[PDB]
Swiss-Prot record, chains B, G, H:
SUPFAM superfamilies: Globin-like (SSF46458). It comes from the Eukaryota. InterPro entries: Globin-like_sf, Phycobilisome_asu/bsu, Phycobilisome_asu/bsu_sf. (2R,3E)-phycoerythrobilin 1 binds at C82. This is B-phycoerythrin beta chain. The gene is cpeB. Heteromer of 6 alpha, 6 beta and one gamma chain. It is a peripheral membrane protein. Contains two covalently linked phycoerythrobilin chromophores and one covalently linked phycourobilin chromophore. It comes from Porphyridium purpureum. The keyword Plastid applies.
Length: 164, 177, 40, 172, 324, 164, 177, 177
């Protein structure tokens, strides 16, 4: 849970110190950023069912070969286990917009993902294609403000740089 | 580890639900009353070593058995560590107030404290009194009920954290018991 | 006599310092080699 | 040693590429500032004894333990070796001003100057104060308008201060 | 940045900056289930210290899966992880099987203990365990004696300590630390005194000869010298390095005497000009003007300033000047 | 040099990762404090000779036995070394106000203080008798703004707990 | 280690001076131009994993002997390390842009990289080409002048922040040479 | 490492000899004056704390640049290290006085001290004034010549030990200069 609070209280504890003034004003910045980080989270929370749909079938448009036998898309349950696999990644981003930092991604999503995808024969190139779809057609005056979108996209390209 | 922000993201995770406008007001008032949390840790840490020595030498003026011959606080070596056992637990409940959740010390400060004090014969009768008077030093600093110290603070209310930090002080008194 | 010396084994209990160590590491050094016969 | 023209060539030769049209424009900008580059090293080398001795005198005026008996400038020979070192550095900064880069300053003055002053016992904090005093004695002297036509020299004067700050930080 | 007087500190400008920042202290007995984002930092910090900034590829790391699992269970850092990791194949490949025996002892002192073997008896105390009990008890002797337990905790990663006064070794072993640990962006394979194939402190570690300290990043960080004895009993050759004594009438005439070390000596850049000579480029025996770079000198005080100009105006650069 | 920037680039180099928004929201609070924290260091620098003189004259006046022979305040050059010893501490608190955190204090004056006053017989009880005068003599409507005096008085209490 | 505010302290400590109205003005523009510097490091941490592989391929496409048997990047493990060696260099330049001054890559990366690369045998011309690619990649990312990706910023200037990060890349080539 | 007794047995080991008449006479004289050797060592370690405070304050009052900003003893961390760099020096000289042989400070203190001080930046021309002051203090204690402390002793002469301890204190200044 690598947020702004749990990185200063771990730095003082490693030295054996009390929370000094350099700790108390790095959490002032947590206050002046929540207004551009929390309204981008509820907007995802009230519209995640319609945005994970058009982002889900983007990889099923580009990598349309996936529905061959021996691959990730044979039967309908492999699709239902695919629109679930992408529904989680919008939730783990939604947790990273209410904890402040990049905590819930790199312990639950990112951690242990390179080895579950190598042995289950899941191509990671369709993960980075479905994620970069919803990263690339949000427009800043309609769905968010100019300050929420830079916050929202920064946790999106954290995924693509971790997978690829 | 798990602060007040990370507390709601595992309660919502274990039911597999998005965090939304039903429960984003409890973190809206948390942010909007965050300056009261900064005006409470800064009013503790300014005399954090002072409220140890008033309490660890204030524990013994109710109980002269600690500097009895054969007592637990007899020598200078045992008195160095008692003032050292008394500055860690104050430091770790400073960590639980900047975070907003107790989970920083039930894995680091209190994980197995009960078995070390019964190993060394550190008695459970005095350490509860050693933190109860330090808790009263803690709750008397965030509000301006201290005697010779009156820090110039902005007006308002601080009875919210005063029922909170003392709730982080009787959990160690229930863990070492 | 066996060798040049007869130093004790590191598998014997109560061999480390345990003076001003952490509470994580104090409990590790008092129960060093006593766990077997407690469960026997 | 290299100058500012032999620096661009040695860069381009390692990549083996033909100098661009927008890289001859940088060198033809560098020749248009050519008279003023001579107007600074003429104003400095015609004042070199007044630059050193007015700044050496100001050094021992506020650090009297250097010339107190027992210090690291009390002898006539330990003092004559001190004004020599303040003139060594000014000579290799004026060498590094017509060249346009600090290549003759490093390879012939500064590489080894810190290792020398640790061995001999010379206090490196006071060689900085000696060097920094000659910098603004020369910066204010290079802004003298007398004899030169009035224009702007603020990108060359800032470059001469950069060679002094490099030689000061390479001895501490 | 270099120097010793700028920030009123001197050890963080010898390459020990990043080592002076970390603790990696593992504040709980077992790893908490549900999470891995805190103990993965403890795992990888143990890897960069015990292997010494070595690269371990993800297939090389996946050989050591079992161990990393017991330490994340209820087991400890020194005996269940650092002792298990030094008995794997990814450790024995780089630090044991590539080297002679004394290369292995010098790297187990650096990796496990964080210091230097000073004197022949620290080598011999660890050499004799291998001859009677093999490798798997030779690693135990670095752990289960009376040095590890009093310095590092049960759950702290073994940080570097061979430079500080608490490690009561010597002052010659202070200079030997800055031959092993040459900065933070360096590894054991990646320093020019041991290329994972030899013994880094062979003659100087046995005889406790102090070395000149050359700071990493200084102009002259490439200084390296080869070894030959002199004297007819050991059947050695004269003319390779300089002496370390300055013994005779040339000691105190021309002032006191210093030992200077030069490194960069190329064939252009000798004469009193700016450009290389053109023509034949070599004499008839076609060796060089300087048949090897890294020359060292012994010079008095009254000849130090003419020598300094001969060094730098002919291309060389000064790595260290120590007084003799 | 513990500041807000040096906290996070050393927390990140510990893990070996890139600066995320758990490192960028910290430096936002560095902007939300420098408008008032740098205001106190502007006042202290142009006033320090009127403050260091009032600070020592509230120490010797209470600790009048230090001017007896045999003590650490014998003659005029020792007392002239007593204003030099305090005008460092008013300079080190000036250096902490511009780096944001408590960087210069805990490694230039504090680090090693227990051995340089116990050896040279310097009483550590008189140092706190002068700094607490300067803290208790701090009047936020006239002399400062109300938010400088929150944090200017917070570094003197870092000295007092580290000297006691 | 030393940020921009940590550099005016050590410069004023050698004078033993107080920082004042002539030196605070240089740092008062540093907090006014802080929302651009936070806006610009975000643009390079986002496109970080693509800048590396574009530069190791770009070095290889100009020097095809580097994958030949006997070249430095021949096998997989030698190639995998070059993608590692090239991104620790980028990770400290993202640090030195975040602080303000060049003393985090100087004393943790370039203090010891000259003799790192003359012990492994890494060519010091191929590596400074891969640095000079990422120098141009970051300058064309800081200004919105990249070809295939554009990021939405508030309109203004970052020419000063562009030439600052070029100076950080330019001393890597001067160090390891 | 080696005492006066083991110095003899390694000289007669080279001859494959025993110990006889002429080689035990200088060794029985060590045992004869052995009560005075203990009686001199105790006079140093009884008041070594004032001997290291007065010594490094005599170097400072002679060289006022050591506490300048940029002086080697400027901050408290560098000054406290000086206060124990000379306390380690005094500990090893009192070992060589006790054992009667200079082979213990030669091994564990002097060997490599010159190369250590030039690395850290310690001025070695000012470290020798601190030892030469301690040489004058140590010979003014094993002879009752200290101006402000007189110690009771049995009657007799101890000028041979005054030249023994002055040979140790001069080789510390010969190993670092
Ligand atoms: C002996 C029997 C005995 C003492 C010794 C002394 C210690 C003590 N003090 C309290 C209550 C408080 N202590 C406080 C601490 C401080 N007050 C200050 O102003 C300074 C900053 C600081 C000391 C460094 C505070 C604020 C309180 C609460 C208000 C009050 O004055 O009571 C106790 C607790 C008593 C109890 O409930 O058991 C003790 C032991 N008091 C003694 O009686
Ligand atoms: C209870 C502990 C107190 C009390 C607290 C209140 N404080 C209020 C506001 C406040 N406090 C600070 C300083 C704080 N902010 C920081 O960023 C840092 C350090 C980095 C600290 C210590 C500020 C800046 C503010 C905002 C108002 C101002 O600028 O003056 C406050 C009002 C806000 C609210 O209620 O939400 C309260 C009630 N007040 C009390 O009466 C007791 C004693
Ligand atoms: C030059 C590199 C760019 C450019 C930069 C500008 N950015 C400006 C404003 C800006 N950016 C952010 C986001 C940033 N700040 C944060 O605190 C965090 C996360 C913690 C991030 C990612 C913010 C908040 C702002 C300020 C917006 C506002 O207050 O309106 C900006 C305008 C400010 C100024 O001009 O001083 C500029 C110029 N813009 C460009 O066009 C080039 C390409
Ligand atoms: C501590 C007070 C000891 C003690 C030590 C002795 N010091 C002796 C000589 C001596 N003391 C100083 C330092 C003094 N002179 C100064 O100029 C300054 C500061 C500016 C100071 C603090 C020096 C320099 C010397 C020796 C001169 C030299 O050789 O360079 C000494 C010898 C006899 C004597 O002078 O009293 C002793 C015994 N005296 C004590 O009684 C306590 C235990
Ligand atoms: C020159 C260094 C001194 C001095 C030395 C003399 N000491 C003499 C006798 C002596 N000292 C002690 C105490 C000493 N012996 C111990 O066993 C221990 C600690 C365990 C200590 C400190 C004793 C017991 C004796 C023996 C006789 C006695 O005093 O009862 C001595 C005369 C006897 C001899 O030479 O063997 C001398 C000359 N005296 C001086 O005047 C200077 C200061
Ligand atoms: C902005 C770049 C364009 C724009 C594109 C359009 N999007 C349209 C529908 C649509 N957009 C989204 C993404 C958006 N809705 C969300 O709920 C969230 C996150 C919580 C985001 C980023 C979705 C999911 C949908 C489909 C369902 C819906 O409308 O909510 C749209 C109309 C139909 C279409 O063309 O797809 C357009 C034109 N819209 C704009 O106004 C600017 C030009
Ligand atoms: C003082 C108000 C108490 C009291 C204190 C004593 N504690 C003693 C030893 C001791 N305490 C701990 C726990 C402490 N160490 C930690 O690492 C942490 C958390 C991170 C805590 C809270 C440990 C582990 C030990 C073992 C010895 C040691 O580590 O120093 C102690 C005895 C010291 C000794 O035996 O030498 C005392 C007196 N005891 C009291 O009677 C009052 C109530
Ligand atoms: C800059 C620090 C001065 C300054 C300099 C200017 N000098 C200008 C022209 C100029 N300078 C020289 C002397 C130079 N040329 C040589 O050949 C030699 C040695 C033999 C020297 C010292 C000459 C001959 C000229 C005439 C060429 C010309 O007209 O450019 C100059 C240009 C004039 C102008 O811009 O109006 C400038 C600016 N002027 C300053 O104000 C500062 C103090
Ligand atoms: C998968 C089909 C299973 C299952 C597997 C899990 N195992 C988990 C943790 C874990 N497992 C072991 C035993 C392993 N380590 C060994 O050394 C050996 C044999 C020599 C074995 C078999 C250990 C020690 C642990 C501790 C955790 C750790 O090592 O980090 C585990 C949870 C991982 C976690 O909590 O993060 C799982 C899911 N569990 C299942 O439900 C199915 C049946
Ligand atoms: C790629 C752009 C280069 C290239 C890179 C190679 N680097 C190799 C090994 C290596 N590199 C470093 C330095 C790196 N580690 C750090 O901690 C930092 C900065 C803080 C940096 C820059 C180290 C320490 C090592 C040693 C790894 C080890 O010994 O395990 C390397 C060889 C890898 C191997 O031999 O297994 C290569 C090929 N080489 C190239 O040709 C291009 C120019
Ligand atoms: C004080 C009179 C001197 C002076 C002393 C300093 N020593 C500094 C560091 C240091 N010194 C030693 C040598 C010491 N330690 C030993 O273990 C032994 C022999 C057994 C000796 C003689 C070492 C090893 C070190 C490294 C630091 C450490 O070990 O912790 C030092 C600098 C401290 C710093 O760098 O911050 C000083 C100032 N220097 C002086 O100016 C006077 C002459
Ligand atoms: C809480 C976090 C969380 C995640 C991130 C995912 C991650 C994840 N996905 C799958 C499992 C899967 N994930 C996918 C999804 C896809 N396959 C592809 O190649 C496409 C990229 C994508 C479709 C869009 C599919 C098809 C499976 C089934 C694979 C199989 O069972 O053979 C599994 C194995 C268990 C299972 O079969 O369900 C796990 C752990 N699940 C989680 O619980
Ligand atoms: C400090 C005190 C101290 C001790 C007393 C011993 C105690 C001791 N003995 C053994 C171990 C043993 N001890 C004995 C001894 C005996 N068995 C018999 O049949 C006889 C009754 C008796 C001796 C006559 C035997 C036979 C072993 C078995 C070794 C093995 O299992 O291979 C071990 C485990 C092996 C080891 O750790 O090295 C230990 C700790 N070690 C110590 O450090
Ligand atoms: C840059 C960081 C820095 C500091 C924090 C101080 C700390 C400090 N003060 C003194 C030294 C001193 N400090 C004092 C001051 C006092 N003594 C007292 O007894 C009173 C309590 C108090 C008056 C206010 C005096 C009188 C001395 C000289 C003591 C002596 O050696 O005679 C010394 C020894 C060096 C010296 O003699 O100057 C040092 C390191 N100095 C520094 O350079």
């Amino acid at each position: 849970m690598k947020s702004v609070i749990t990185t200063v209280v771990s730095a003082a504890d490693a030295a054996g110190r009390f929370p000094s003034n350099s700790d108390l004003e790095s959490i002032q910045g947590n206050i002046q950023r929540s207004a551009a980080r929390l309204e981008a989270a509820e907007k995802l929370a009230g519209n995640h069912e319609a945005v994970v749909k058009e982002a889900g079938d983007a990889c099923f448009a580009k990598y349309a070969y996936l529905k061959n036998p021996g691959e990730a898309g044979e039967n309908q349950e492999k699709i239902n286990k695919c629109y679930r696999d992408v529904d989680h990644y919008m939730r783990l981003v939604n947790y990273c917009l209410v904890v402040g930092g990049t905590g819930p991604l790199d312990e639950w999503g990112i951690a242990g993902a390179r080895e579950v995808y190598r042995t289950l024969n899941l191509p990671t190139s369709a993960y980075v294609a479905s994620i970069a779809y919803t990263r690339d057609r949000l427009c800043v005056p309609r769905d968010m403000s100019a300050q929420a979108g830079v916050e929202f996209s920064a946790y999106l390209d954290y995924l693509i740089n971790a997978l690829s | 580890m798990l602060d007040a922000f990370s507390r709601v993201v595992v309660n919502s995770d274990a039911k597999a639900a998005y965090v939304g406008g039903s429960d984003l007001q409890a973190l809206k008032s948390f942010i909007a009353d965050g300056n009261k949390r900064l005006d409470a840790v800064n009013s503790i840490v300014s005399n954090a070593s002072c409220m140890v020595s008033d309490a660890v030498s204030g524990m013994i003026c109710e109980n002269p058995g600690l500097i009895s011959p054969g007592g637990n606080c007899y020598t200078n070596r045992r008195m160095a560590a008692c003032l050292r056992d008394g500055e860690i637990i104050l430091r770790y409940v400073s960590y639980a107030l900047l975070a907003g959740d107790a989970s920083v010390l039930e894995d680091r400060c209190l994980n197995g404290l009960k078995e070390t004090y019964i190993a060394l014969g550190v008695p459970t009768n005095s350490s509860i009194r050693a933190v109860s008077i330090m808790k009263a030093q803690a709750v008397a600093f965030i509000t301006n009920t201290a005697t010779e110290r009156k820090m110039s603070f902005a007006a308002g209310d601080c009875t919210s954290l005063a029922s909170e930090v003392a709730s982080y002080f009787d959990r160690v008194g229930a863990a070492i018991s | 006599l066996t060798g040049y010396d007869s130093k004790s084994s590191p598998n014997f209990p109560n061999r480390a310092a345990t003076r001003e160590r952490r509470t994580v590491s104090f409990n590790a050094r008092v129960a060093r080699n006593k766990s077997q016969a407690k469960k026997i | 040693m290299l100058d500012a023209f032999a620096k661009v060539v040695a860069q381009a030769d390692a990549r083996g590429e033909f100098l661009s049209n927008t890289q001859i424009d940088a060198l033809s900008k560098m020749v248009k500032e050519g008279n003023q580059r001579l107007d600074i090293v003429n104003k400095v080398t015609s004042n070199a004894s007044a630059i050193v001795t007015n700044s050496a005198r100001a050094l021992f005026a506020e650090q009297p333990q250097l010339i107190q008996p027992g210090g690291n400038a009390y002898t006539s020979r330990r003092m004559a070796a001190c004004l020599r070192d303040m003139e060594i550095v000014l000579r290799y900064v004026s060498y590094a001003m017509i060249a346009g880069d600090s290549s003759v300053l490093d390879d012939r003055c500064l590489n080894g100057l810190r290792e020398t002053y640790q061995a001999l016992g010379t206090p490196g904090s006071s060689v900085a104060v000696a060097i920094q005093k000659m910098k603004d004695a020369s910066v204010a002297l290079a802004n003298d308008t007398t004899g030169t036509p009035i224009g702007d020299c603020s990108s060359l004067v800032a470059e001469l201060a950069g060679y002094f700050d490099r030689a000061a930080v390479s001895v501490v | 940045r270099l120097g010793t007087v700028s920030g009123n500190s001197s050890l963080d400008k010898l390459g020990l900056d990043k080592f002076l920042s970390e603790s990696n202290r593992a504040y709980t007995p077992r790893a908490q289930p549900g999470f891995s984002s805190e103990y993965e930092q403890i795992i990888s910090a143990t890897y960069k210290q015990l292997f010494g900034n070595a690269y371990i590829m993800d297939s090389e790391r996946a050989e050591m899966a079992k161990q990393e699992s017991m330490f994340r269970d209820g087991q400890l850092t020194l005996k269940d992880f650092c002792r298990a990791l030094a008995k794997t194949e990814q450790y024995k490949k780089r630090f044991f099987d590539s080297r002679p025996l004394y290369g292995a002892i010098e790297l187990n002192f650096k990796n496990i203990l964080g210091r230097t073997p000073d004197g022949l008896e620290h080598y011999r105390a660890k050499s004799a365990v291998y001859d009677t009990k093999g490798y798997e008890a030779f690693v135990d002797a670095f752990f289960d004696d009376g040095e590890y337990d009093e310095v590092y905790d049960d759950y702290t990663v073994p940080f570097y300590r061979g430079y500080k006064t608490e490690a009561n070794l010597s002052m010659a072993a202070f200079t030997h630390f800055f031959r092993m640990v040459r900065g933070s962006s360096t590894s054991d394979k990646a320093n020019p005194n041991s290329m994972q194939k030899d013994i880094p402190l062979n003659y100087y570690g046995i005889t406790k000869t102090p070395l000149a300290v050359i700071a990493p990043g200084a102009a002259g960080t490439a200084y390296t010298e080869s070894f030959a004895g002199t004297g007819s009993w050991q059947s050695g050759r004269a003319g390779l390095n300089a002496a370390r004594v300055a013994l005779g009438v040339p000691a105190t005439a021309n002032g006191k005497s210093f030992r200077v070390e030069v490194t960069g000596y190329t064939q252009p850049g000798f004469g009193i000009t700016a450009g290389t000579a053109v023509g034949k480029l070599y004499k008839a025996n076609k060796l060089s003007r300087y048949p090897r770079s890294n020359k060292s000198y012994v010079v008095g005080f009254d000849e130090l300033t003419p020598l300094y100009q001969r060094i730098t105006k002919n291309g060389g650069t000064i790595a260290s000047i120590t007084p003799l």
